[PDB]
């Protein structure tokens, strides 16, 4: 109602999008502006941290640089000896010139090559003024064969710039007093017509480059067409006399970046295809640890279906199309002006040498460029909801972090945006799943313990079953988050450093924070949850923790110490002594690959809990008779009397349990 | 939040997108290329629909 200003490209939109891409501009927030203040103080301590990091410490690191650099001042200190040697030979020899030629001295009597000729020695200014070969040797041009507009009319426009059009006369000399009135005004009028000719050849030939979309993408017609533009930017007057030739290379390519930028924008964002639910592959990394090891592995390394390049394809494609936004935009370092340098009279050297690579190629410069925004934000924002990565994509996103060291392009800042695809790619690094492990070990304890409130007994009458899920089949994703960290993550590499590993400490929080998440499994430490606890830990610690790459070993023997301590508590009314402790207490987990009768799902032979409590209370507690039984067997006395032939001294030892709680002759000597 | 609240007052849509149609004409007296402000009046449009 109070219609506000014309928002035409203010101090924002120079990545103020990417500035506001800290978390979200999703409603809205001034709270998020405070969050920006927090990230600003984070950068303030990281940059004061860089400051005193580099202020004496890496200013001595700069003195460690002054080994090489003061060494350059040491060969350059021989250049002080070469400079005082040449300056001493020419100092004393030029003093000998001061006494030699100036014997009279009197330069109008002893050295009068220039005192006879105070202006007549500077008498080589006869090329004035205009304008024969400015438009005759270049119609628009006459060029493209190292021809008279390349070889001659260019250099005639260098004569239009050799003519210093504002240094006209100095009337005691008076070389171009009135000749400078229209020398480069007709040479820059006719070359203003050649300038508008190359401007219409820039919008025209660059609209043909907008038609040039050769092969994914590739603007190869803009490369051979860029060979038809190196002479326009070489063109040494100089070439942009009033920032115009570069405006034919940049302001003409302003909209003609957005033909290539719109091209990649609609182009790269169309490769979308995914799966739905992969509990089968977690039954292949649960079937891996079943037949392993203890067997031949299983896994292969098996799937890990993410190792098939659903998103790792772009790691060589949208890092290469990002390397069209960067490295073929570093072939727009063959089209910036080009590479304006170098021809020098005025198209002489680039009349011969007009063939750049340009990409990438080294690093010693200072420059700036554009045309990489939406390919970067497309590659990262495309890769966003990726919750399986970057666990298996550790060396992928860290190779992306360590991609571009040695170029002079902004592909390092892309690799830093691809470090942001490892680091500003947020806590995935997924230790909020530990917050899901304690928070879902408390707010989901109303379902697993709802069958297991009494778990290892039957006082509140519940079966010892809770489950290890999260991280049960996520322990299968330790072999699937670790198996594809050696093939898929290794096939995502690049220049310095980039895998070269070297990297993937993620992947060491698959030791560190996986033993922290597995310490929440130690906070999750029921006997199908002790059985599922050590079966899940050892379902990762059969192959993934010895290759010995984990840190949950003491978590596995800690929850397995709770499997000994709670499987002989679930069988604390059964074994007693070893009569249920070998095939009926630990083998309710070993053969599984209310707690009195509730070990009867696998119930490995012999003397299971369905007979250690019944066929020991059926004329077996004293003996088949009474002290002692005539049976040491392996069929039913193993529940009855071979148990008594395996717990013989445990009769009097078990009767000693009443001898501390509430002498020993008539029971411990003559027990019959 | 004003939208589902009352009517939105209607002024909390009417006057709110009037005095916001001020700055939605910040997003309309020129736009190039404020995809920020374009996203702003974009969600204003979708909410109004």
XYZ file of C-alpha atoms in Angstrom:
721
model
C 0.000 0.000 0.000
C 3.105 2.153 0.536
C 4.859 0.692 -2.518
C 8.540 0.409 -1.750
C 11.771 0.832 -3.647
C 13.046 -0.508 -6.953
C 15.005 -3.533 -5.686
C 17.449 -3.653 -8.593
C 20.677 -5.337 -7.394
C 21.572 -3.700 -4.070
C 24.389 -4.718 -1.623
C 22.650 -8.149 -1.361
C 22.241 -11.110 -3.801
C 26.039 -11.257 -3.862
C 25.598 -14.661 -2.164
C 23.237 -13.070 0.381
C 21.229 -16.107 -0.618
C 24.218 -18.223 0.390
C 24.628 -16.025 3.456
C 20.983 -16.722 4.374
C 21.699 -20.374 3.481
C 23.255 -20.855 6.925
C 20.192 -22.770 8.086
C 17.039 -21.533 6.290
C 15.093 -18.508 5.259
C 12.109 -20.699 6.185
C 9.953 -18.363 8.310
C 12.070 -16.396 8.862
C 13.892 -15.430 11.282
C 15.152 -12.549 13.373
C 15.849 -15.470 15.670
C 17.932 -16.765 12.783
C 19.510 -13.298 12.601
C 20.601 -13.890 16.182
C 21.817 -17.285 14.959
C 23.816 -15.386 12.351
C 25.281 -13.314 15.180
C 26.324 -16.561 16.849
C 27.988 -17.797 13.668
C 29.625 -14.368 13.378
C 31.171 -14.708 16.814
C 32.188 -18.246 15.839
C 34.044 -16.800 12.870
C 35.414 -14.065 15.144
C 37.074 -16.586 17.428
C 38.156 -18.656 14.439
C 39.737 -15.562 12.867
C 41.303 -14.091 15.941
C 42.317 -17.743 16.285
C 43.784 -17.443 12.809
C 45.246 -14.081 13.841
C 47.304 -15.147 16.838
C 47.745 -18.429 14.992
C 49.602 -16.381 12.380
C 50.735 -13.379 14.410
C 53.917 -14.732 15.913
C 53.380 -18.485 15.535
C 52.720 -18.720 11.806
C 54.448 -15.399 11.486
C 57.377 -17.590 12.417
C 55.742 -19.977 9.977
C 56.235 -16.968 7.736
C 59.787 -16.909 9.042
C 59.805 -20.602 8.158
C 58.712 -19.271 4.769
C 61.615 -16.778 4.974
C 63.924 -19.741 4.680
C 62.802 -19.823 1.045
C 61.985 -16.086 0.926
C 65.001 -14.700 2.721
C 66.797 -17.293 0.578
C 65.258 -15.409 -2.334
C 66.755 -12.392 -0.564
C 70.014 -14.396 -0.498
C 70.271 -15.145 -4.186
C 68.764 -11.665 -4.337
C 71.528 -10.683 -1.920
C 73.866 -11.920 -4.607
C 71.714 -9.643 -6.789
C 72.714 -7.002 -4.235
C 76.270 -8.003 -5.102
C 75.321 -8.259 -8.775
C 73.510 -4.921 -8.448
C 76.365 -3.239 -6.620
C 78.795 -5.037 -8.941
C 77.049 -3.817 -12.089
C 76.232 -0.545 -10.314
C 79.896 -0.222 -9.277
C 81.260 -0.992 -12.744
C 78.721 1.482 -14.131
C 79.163 3.839 -11.162
C 82.914 4.292 -11.590
C 82.751 3.737 -15.362
C 79.937 6.296 -15.608
C 82.086 8.684 -13.573
C 84.722 7.988 -16.228
C 81.966 8.923 -18.691
C 81.394 12.121 -16.700
C 85.053 13.063 -17.133
C 85.425 11.375 -20.543
C 82.812 12.848 -22.890
C 82.570 16.020 -20.790
C 86.191 17.023 -21.222
C 84.916 20.541 -21.835
C 81.389 19.790 -20.571
C 79.973 22.279 -21.992
C 77.526 19.814 -23.563
C 77.114 22.255 -26.466
C 80.859 21.857 -27.097
C 81.676 18.297 -25.976
C 78.529 16.125 -26.264
C 76.367 18.108 -28.673
C 74.457 15.263 -30.322
C 71.548 16.569 -28.211
C 72.626 20.181 -27.636
C 72.567 20.796 -31.362
C 69.350 18.765 -31.256
C 67.409 19.675 -28.080
C 64.275 18.814 -30.070
C 65.886 17.609 -33.319
C 67.054 14.354 -31.727
C 63.401 13.576 -30.886
C 62.345 14.078 -34.524
C 60.740 10.672 -35.219
C 57.115 11.855 -34.890
C 56.083 11.950 -38.561
C 53.426 9.188 -38.529
C 50.646 11.762 -38.078
C 47.752 11.472 -38.165
C 44.711 9.780 -39.694
C 42.938 7.811 -41.117
C 43.795 5.762 -44.212
C 44.394 2.207 -42.980
C 42.100 2.527 -39.939
C 38.985 1.555 -41.929
C 40.466 0.450 -45.270
C 42.667 -2.275 -43.776
C 39.696 -3.276 -41.561
C 36.230 -3.069 -43.116
C 34.724 -4.468 -40.064
C 37.999 -6.326 -40.155
C 40.101 -7.566 -43.046
C 41.559 -10.004 -40.503
C 41.450 -13.749 -39.624
C 44.531 -14.725 -41.634
C 47.076 -12.739 -39.577
C 45.908 -10.209 -42.171
C 45.967 -6.394 -42.497
C 43.494 -5.895 -39.640
C 45.369 -8.389 -37.481
C 48.919 -7.531 -38.521
C 48.619 -3.899 -39.672
C 45.388 -2.027 -38.813
C 45.618 -3.327 -35.256
C 49.165 -1.933 -35.055
C 47.871 1.204 -36.771
C 45.494 1.511 -33.820
C 48.586 1.030 -31.661
C 49.875 4.042 -33.570
C 46.589 5.684 -32.591
C 47.713 4.946 -29.017
C 51.387 5.646 -29.697
C 49.975 9.072 -30.497
C 49.469 10.480 -27.005
C 46.298 12.334 -27.970
C 46.360 14.675 -24.968
C 50.133 15.255 -25.143
C 49.675 17.330 -28.262
C 52.417 19.880 -28.866
C 54.634 21.187 -26.063
C 54.855 23.886 -28.695
C 58.635 24.255 -28.622
C 58.479 20.647 -29.913
C 54.973 20.698 -31.492
C 54.639 17.249 -33.045
C 50.854 16.687 -32.851
C 49.471 20.155 -32.045
C 46.546 20.077 -34.487
C 47.375 16.601 -35.814
C 46.231 15.209 -32.462
C 42.783 16.770 -32.852
C 41.463 13.955 -35.067
C 44.229 11.322 -35.251
C 42.694 8.821 -32.832
C 39.318 10.547 -33.146
C 39.129 9.351 -36.742
C 41.147 6.251 -35.861
C 38.794 5.720 -32.904
C 35.843 6.887 -34.993
C 36.613 4.364 -37.729
C 37.787 2.011 -34.973
C 34.650 3.007 -33.095
C 32.857 1.551 -36.115
C 35.168 -1.460 -35.925
C 34.504 -1.430 -32.171
C 30.744 -1.548 -32.679
C 31.486 -4.116 -35.397
C 33.210 -6.384 -32.870
C 30.458 -5.554 -30.362
C 27.815 -6.774 -32.802
C 30.203 -9.660 -33.523
C 30.326 -10.233 -29.742
C 26.570 -10.303 -29.163
C 26.179 -12.090 -32.508
C 29.040 -14.595 -32.203
C 28.196 -15.032 -28.511
C 24.562 -15.644 -29.431
C 25.989 -18.327 -31.720
C 27.875 -19.522 -28.645
C 24.458 -19.495 -26.964
C 23.490 -21.767 -29.836
C 26.720 -23.676 -29.165
C 25.742 -26.458 -26.755
C 27.936 -29.212 -28.161
C 28.503 -32.184 -25.834
C 27.435 -32.260 -22.132
C 27.356 -29.294 -22.133
C 29.974 -28.254 -23.609
C 30.155 -24.905 -25.440
C 32.929 -26.224 -27.681
C 31.488 -23.918 -30.340
C 32.158 -21.188 -27.779
C 35.750 -22.472 -27.581
C 36.433 -22.382 -31.314
C 34.298 -19.227 -31.288
C 36.505 -18.007 -28.438
C 39.420 -18.469 -30.830
C 37.514 -15.922 -32.955
C 37.527 -13.507 -29.983
C 41.162 -13.619 -28.805
C 42.084 -11.085 -31.510
C 39.272 -8.805 -30.292
C 40.580 -8.799 -26.724
C 44.259 -8.724 -27.703
C 43.719 -5.712 -30.003
C 46.162 -3.513 -28.143
C 44.536 -0.120 -27.960
C 44.355 -1.431 -25.181
C 42.146 -3.470 -26.032
C 39.325 -1.894 -24.052
C 39.997 1.810 -24.582
C 37.021 2.829 -22.423
C 36.298 -0.549 -20.747
C 34.491 -1.620 -23.906
C 36.292 -4.706 -25.252
C 36.038 -6.360 -21.843
C 32.383 -5.258 -21.812
C 32.145 -7.183 -25.074
C 33.780 -10.063 -23.209
C 31.882 -9.656 -19.910
C 28.893 -7.298 -20.177
C 28.041 -8.929 -23.491
C 28.549 -12.294 -21.780
C 26.462 -11.031 -18.837
C 23.258 -12.374 -20.354
C 25.409 -14.947 -22.182
C 26.668 -16.360 -18.950
C 22.992 -17.015 -18.134
C 22.557 -18.965 -21.351
C 25.292 -21.315 -20.160
C 24.244 -20.771 -16.539
C 20.572 -21.287 -17.366
C 21.720 -24.252 -19.467
C 23.454 -25.981 -16.558
C 20.665 -24.771 -14.246
C 17.896 -26.614 -16.048
C 20.377 -29.306 -17.119
C 22.054 -30.813 -14.069
C 19.036 -31.049 -11.726
C 17.260 -33.880 -13.581
C 19.133 -37.068 -12.564
C 16.761 -37.907 -9.687
C 16.230 -41.616 -8.980
C 16.305 -43.516 -5.680
C 15.260 -46.591 -3.670
C 12.518 -46.923 -1.038
C 13.462 -49.307 1.800
C 16.469 -51.591 2.021
C 15.973 -54.014 4.910
C 16.984 -56.725 2.420
C 20.528 -55.336 2.228
C 20.529 -55.088 6.020
C 19.608 -58.763 5.877
C 22.669 -59.141 3.647
C 24.803 -57.320 6.212
C 22.815 -59.200 8.826
C 23.217 -62.336 6.695
C 26.883 -61.352 6.388
C 27.561 -61.548 10.142
C 25.401 -64.691 10.347
C 27.726 -66.771 8.150
C 30.893 -65.074 9.481
C 33.534 -65.396 10.794
C 33.297 -68.436 12.067
C 32.939 -68.907 8.253
C 34.086 -67.358 4.986
C 32.867 -63.781 4.601
C 29.992 -62.650 3.934
C 30.298 -59.820 3.240
C 32.040 -59.550 -0.127
C 32.132 -56.394 0.588
C 28.410 -56.639 -0.151
C 25.818 -53.877 -0.370
C 25.908 -50.874 0.561
C 23.615 -50.222 -2.424
C 24.532 -46.509 -2.105
C 27.992 -47.414 -3.501
C 26.274 -47.691 -6.869
C 26.644 -44.114 -8.025
C 23.202 -42.660 -7.319
C 24.938 -39.535 -5.987
C 28.613 -40.438 -6.526
C 27.979 -40.072 -10.268
C 27.738 -36.299 -9.798
C 31.040 -36.485 -7.883
C 32.628 -36.911 -11.318
C 29.804 -35.131 -13.197
C 28.567 -32.135 -11.175
C 32.099 -31.708 -9.912
C 32.918 -31.679 -13.620
C 29.864 -29.536 -14.402
C 30.822 -27.573 -11.329
C 34.135 -27.661 -13.203
C 32.197 -26.059 -16.024
C 31.022 -23.427 -13.581
C 34.673 -23.381 -12.453
C 37.153 -25.157 -14.737
C 35.441 -24.575 -18.072
C 34.798 -21.167 -16.595
C 38.564 -21.456 -16.281
C 38.191 -22.015 -19.996
C 36.324 -18.764 -19.649
C 39.751 -17.888 -18.351
C 40.277 -18.346 -22.061
C 37.221 -16.065 -22.422
C 37.456 -13.531 -19.540
C 38.842 -11.072 -21.962
C 40.494 -14.117 -22.891
C 43.447 -13.941 -21.280
C 43.715 -10.417 -22.792
C 47.507 -10.822 -22.901
C 49.483 -10.714 -25.122
C 50.001 -9.353 -28.629
C 51.613 -5.927 -28.015
C 51.759 -4.431 -31.551
C 48.792 -4.368 -31.491
C 47.865 -7.849 -32.645
C 51.342 -9.321 -33.216
C 52.078 -12.066 -30.676
C 48.448 -13.161 -30.325
C 48.285 -12.975 -34.103
C 50.527 -16.030 -33.775
C 49.714 -17.259 -30.252
C 45.914 -17.243 -29.844
C 45.469 -20.788 -28.510
C 44.869 -21.137 -24.754
C 44.061 -24.268 -22.774
C 43.153 -22.314 -20.402
C 42.169 -24.653 -17.557
C 43.336 -24.881 -14.903
C 46.514 -24.840 -14.641
C 48.695 -23.630 -11.766
C 48.543 -21.099 -8.921
C 50.358 -17.769 -9.104
C 47.989 -14.841 -9.800
C 45.340 -12.556 -8.319
C 41.951 -12.388 -10.059
C 38.176 -12.702 -9.691
C 35.312 -14.189 -11.698
C 31.709 -15.391 -11.501
C 29.269 -17.921 -13.040
C 29.504 -20.651 -10.409
C 26.599 -19.912 -8.042
C 23.733 -22.148 -9.103
C 25.851 -25.135 -10.139
C 27.382 -25.166 -6.662
C 24.068 -24.615 -4.859
C 22.503 -27.154 -7.219
C 25.164 -29.777 -6.523
C 25.053 -29.327 -2.749
C 21.330 -28.613 -2.353
C 20.708 -31.611 -4.612
C 22.897 -33.712 -2.304
C 21.095 -32.454 0.790
C 18.624 -35.069 2.080
C 21.165 -37.865 1.948
C 20.937 -39.548 5.385
C 22.884 -42.720 4.488
C 25.819 -40.608 3.297
C 28.313 -39.358 4.296
C 29.172 -42.342 6.465
C 30.139 -44.459 3.466
C 30.815 -41.156 1.643
C 33.486 -40.119 4.153
C 36.363 -39.983 1.662
C 33.836 -38.854 -0.955
C 32.854 -35.600 0.786
C 36.351 -35.262 2.276
C 37.939 -35.864 -1.108
C 35.473 -33.156 -2.108
C 36.875 -31.139 0.810
C 40.459 -31.748 -0.311
C 39.728 -31.478 -4.019
C 41.471 -28.360 -5.351
C 44.770 -27.269 -3.796
C 46.987 -26.207 -6.698
C 44.845 -24.258 -9.167
C 44.405 -20.487 -9.242
C 40.657 -20.957 -9.782
C 37.784 -20.724 -7.282
C 37.451 -24.516 -7.442
C 39.179 -24.449 -4.051
C 36.251 -22.356 -2.781
C 34.102 -24.925 -4.560
C 36.117 -27.619 -2.751
C 35.503 -25.485 0.347
C 31.844 -25.469 -0.609
C 32.455 -29.193 -1.084
C 34.105 -29.132 2.294
C 30.831 -27.438 3.180
C 29.358 -30.544 1.552
C 31.267 -32.356 4.295
C 31.111 -29.788 7.118
C 28.270 -27.352 6.495
C 26.687 -30.566 5.500
C 25.625 -30.742 9.105
C 25.837 -33.209 11.983
C 25.654 -36.305 9.757
C 28.242 -36.856 11.671
C 24.973 -38.256 12.883
C 25.493 -38.310 16.679
C 21.982 -36.962 17.163
C 21.142 -40.636 16.573
C 22.742 -41.091 19.988
C 20.169 -38.560 21.192
C 17.715 -40.854 19.435
C 19.374 -43.739 21.285
C 18.888 -42.316 24.791
C 15.791 -40.261 23.958
C 14.439 -43.324 22.169
C 15.862 -45.459 24.960
C 13.485 -43.600 27.310
C 10.471 -42.425 25.270
C 10.329 -45.796 23.496
C 10.872 -47.891 26.642
C 7.061 -48.203 26.821
C 6.963 -50.753 23.961
C 10.030 -53.006 24.270
C 9.792 -53.227 28.067
C 6.002 -53.543 27.685
C 6.785 -57.168 26.882
C 9.813 -57.097 29.205
C 8.894 -55.354 32.480
C 10.006 -58.449 34.444
C 12.305 -59.423 31.644
C 14.801 -61.857 33.162
C 12.127 -63.248 35.543
C 8.350 -63.678 35.803
C 7.491 -61.665 38.923
C 5.759 -58.929 36.922
C 5.312 -61.715 34.317
C 7.107 -60.497 31.210
C 9.335 -62.110 28.579
C 12.994 -61.144 28.261
C 12.639 -59.461 24.844
C 13.305 -55.845 23.897
C 15.296 -55.808 20.638
C 18.474 -54.101 19.437
C 16.926 -52.180 16.517
C 18.464 -48.713 16.199
C 21.249 -49.796 16.018
C 20.385 -53.462 15.263
C 20.267 -53.357 11.473
C 22.235 -50.132 11.723
C 25.016 -52.398 12.938
C 24.497 -53.925 9.492
C 25.022 -50.331 8.321
C 28.358 -50.379 10.100
C 29.428 -52.958 7.529
C 27.453 -51.017 4.922
C 28.688 -47.640 6.174
C 32.204 -49.126 6.355
C 32.244 -51.451 3.330
C 31.576 -48.636 0.838
C 34.167 -46.421 2.559
C 36.880 -48.356 0.685
C 35.368 -48.719 -2.812
C 32.763 -45.983 -3.301
C 34.642 -43.446 -1.178
C 37.935 -44.346 -2.874
C 36.365 -43.915 -6.326
C 35.519 -40.272 -5.588
C 39.040 -38.843 -5.675
C 40.724 -35.828 -7.265
C 43.863 -33.646 -7.049
C 45.595 -32.546 -3.843
C 44.724 -34.071 -1.620
C 41.453 -36.005 -2.184
C 41.785 -39.654 -1.212
C 44.933 -39.790 -0.767
C 43.552 -40.826 2.644
C 44.804 -38.815 4.331
C 41.183 -38.132 5.288
C 37.944 -39.884 6.384
C 37.997 -39.370 10.147
C 34.246 -39.944 9.962
C 35.089 -43.250 9.551
C 37.006 -42.695 12.710
C 33.893 -41.507 14.490
C 32.709 -44.782 13.014
C 35.097 -45.818 15.738
C 34.825 -42.824 18.102
C 31.183 -41.751 17.843
C 30.172 -45.308 16.969
C 31.572 -46.389 20.318
C 29.796 -43.329 21.725
C 26.574 -44.419 20.036
C 27.580 -47.920 21.127
C 28.057 -46.438 24.584
C 24.406 -45.517 24.300
C 24.042 -49.182 23.426
C 25.915 -49.604 26.700
C 23.181 -47.323 28.021
C 20.820 -49.719 26.222
C 22.509 -52.609 28.049
C 16.217 -58.201 28.645
C 17.901 -61.386 27.444
C 16.791 -61.020 23.852
C 18.177 -57.511 24.376
C 21.272 -58.963 26.001
C 21.148 -61.617 23.283
C 20.342 -58.930 20.732
C 22.871 -56.654 22.469
C 25.957 -58.844 22.139
C 24.512 -60.361 18.958
C 24.227 -56.861 17.495
C 27.618 -55.649 18.733
C 29.243 -58.917 17.641
C 27.077 -58.631 14.525
C 29.336 -55.682 13.877
C 32.327 -57.090 15.792
C 32.637 -60.297 13.752
C 34.083 -58.669 10.621
C 34.094 -54.881 11.053
C 35.776 -54.923 14.475
C 38.277 -57.591 13.322
C 39.713 -55.723 9.573
C 39.854 -54.080 12.993
C 38.141 -50.725 12.417
C 35.798 -49.857 15.295
C 36.123 -48.841 18.924
C 33.123 -50.677 20.441
C 35.188 -53.646 21.670
C 34.736 -52.829 25.357
C 31.141 -51.941 24.518
C 30.737 -55.422 23.008
C 32.310 -57.125 26.041
C 30.438 -54.706 28.319
C 27.002 -55.494 26.905
C 28.257 -59.083 26.567
C 29.305 -58.849 30.219
C 25.665 -57.890 30.765
C 24.778 -60.943 28.644
C 26.776 -63.162 30.988
C 25.491 -61.266 34.041
C 21.877 -61.183 32.810
C 21.759 -64.547 31.023
C 22.834 -66.221 34.264
C 20.191 -64.031 35.935
C 17.514 -64.989 33.411
C 18.747 -68.537 34.090
C 19.450 -67.909 37.789
C 16.686 -70.421 38.532
C 18.108 -72.811 35.903
C 21.940 -72.951 36.029
C 22.355 -74.148 38.896
C 25.098 -75.196 38.348
C 26.092 -75.827 34.755
C 22.921 -77.866 34.119
C 21.492 -75.070 31.957
C 24.503 -72.752 31.440
C 25.985 -74.265 28.252
C 23.136 -75.289 25.946
C 20.274 -73.343 27.566
C 21.677 -70.004 28.815
C 24.277 -68.790 26.327
C 22.881 -70.993 23.554
C 19.573 -69.178 23.800
C 21.692 -66.568 21.995
C 24.263 -68.794 20.257
C 21.564 -70.897 18.567
C 19.310 -67.845 18.048
C 21.340 -66.735 15.014
C 9.194 -65.062 31.957
C 12.751 -66.289 31.681
C 12.291 -69.676 33.370
C 10.719 -71.466 30.404
C 11.218 -68.503 28.048
C 14.472 -69.726 26.472
C 12.504 -72.210 24.353
C 12.564 -70.491 20.968
C 15.778 -72.159 19.805
C 16.607 -74.150 22.991
C 19.794 -75.914 21.923
C 20.363 -79.540 22.915
C 20.814 -80.824 25.496
C 18.994 -80.228 28.800
C 17.124 -77.088 27.791
C 15.129 -74.888 30.172
C 12.023 -76.941 29.338
C 13.644 -79.858 31.217
C 16.214 -78.289 33.571
C 13.383 -76.980 35.776
C 10.873 -79.844 35.310
C 13.025 -82.974 34.885
C 15.158 -81.832 37.823
C 12.158 -81.314 40.120
C 10.747 -84.723 39.085
C 12.611 -87.114 41.434
C 16.001 -85.549 40.746
C 16.591 -82.754 43.311
C 18.044 -85.149 45.863
C 18.592 -88.013 43.389
C 16.644 -90.531 41.367
C 16.632 -92.066 44.817
C 18.149 -89.874 47.520
C 21.935 -89.244 47.594
C 22.782 -90.466 45.114
C 21.367 -91.364 41.718
C 22.283 -94.368 39.576
C 22.477 -92.404 36.321
C 25.325 -90.559 34.599
C 23.835 -90.200 31.128
C 23.240 -87.882 28.163
C 19.490 -88.040 27.429
C 17.295 -87.301 30.458
C 19.684 -87.575 33.402
C 21.407 -84.495 31.925
C 18.335 -82.685 33.200
C 18.144 -85.049 36.193
C 21.176 -87.038 37.360
C 24.012 -86.330 34.970
C 23.230 -82.817 36.082
C 23.797 -84.357 39.515
C 26.878 -85.998 37.973
C 27.827 -82.465 36.903
C 26.662 -80.754 40.103
C 27.640 -83.398 42.672
C 29.453 -81.176 45.181
C 26.862 -78.491 44.334
C 24.364 -80.474 46.429
C 26.138 -79.625 49.695
C 27.402 -76.361 48.183
C 23.816 -75.412 47.322
C 22.683 -76.473 50.802
C 25.329 -74.107 52.211
C 23.242 -71.207 50.822
C 21.158 -71.339 54.016
C 24.353 -71.258 56.105
C 24.838 -67.482 55.994
C 21.440 -65.922 55.376
C 19.010 -66.389 58.266
C 27.709 -78.123 62.778
C 27.857 -79.393 59.177
C 28.414 -83.114 59.754
C 25.172 -85.055 59.191
C 24.731 -83.680 55.653
C 28.261 -83.120 54.312
C 29.679 -86.511 55.350
C 26.842 -89.074 55.246
C 24.411 -87.453 52.794
C 22.458 -90.679 52.166
C 0.387 -17.372 11.724
C -2.040 -14.506 11.218
C -3.738 -16.399 8.374
C -5.483 -19.236 10.205
C -5.967 -17.059 13.292
C -9.009 -14.787 12.909
C -9.928 -13.538 9.412
C -6.697 -13.133 9.095
C -8.168 -10.142 10.757
C -9.011 -9.557 7.656
C -6.453 -6.766 8.167
C -3.854 -9.328 9.235
C -4.123 -10.390 5.641
C -5.655 -7.209 4.204
C -3.657 -4.461 5.899
C -0.800 -6.890 6.491
C -0.437 -7.438 2.766
C -1.244 -3.773 2.259
C 1.647 -2.520 4.365
C 3.438 -5.618 3.159
C 2.310 -4.819 -0.388
C 4.465 -1.771 0.209
C 7.525 -3.991 0.486
C 5.965 -6.504 -1.874
C 6.411 -3.580 -4.220
C 9.927 -3.430 -2.999
C 9.696 -6.840 -4.680
C 7.805 -5.182 -7.551
C 9.267 -1.719 -8.222
C 12.255 -3.758 -9.320
C 13.035 -7.402 -8.767
C 16.355 -8.204 -10.494
C 17.367 -10.520 -9.171
C 16.203 -10.626 -5.574
C 15.218 -14.289 -5.350
C 15.211 -13.578 -1.629
C 12.494 -10.943 -2.043
C 10.966 -12.998 -4.854
C 10.769 -15.908 -2.431
C 9.177 -13.514 0.067
C 6.310 -12.366 -2.153
C 6.221 -15.888 -3.580
C 5.213 -17.306 -0.209
C 2.928 -14.302 0.217
C 1.266 -15.412 -3.021
C 0.979 -19.079 -2.058
C -0.396 -18.201 1.371
C -2.892 -15.792 -0.178
C -4.015 -18.575 -2.493
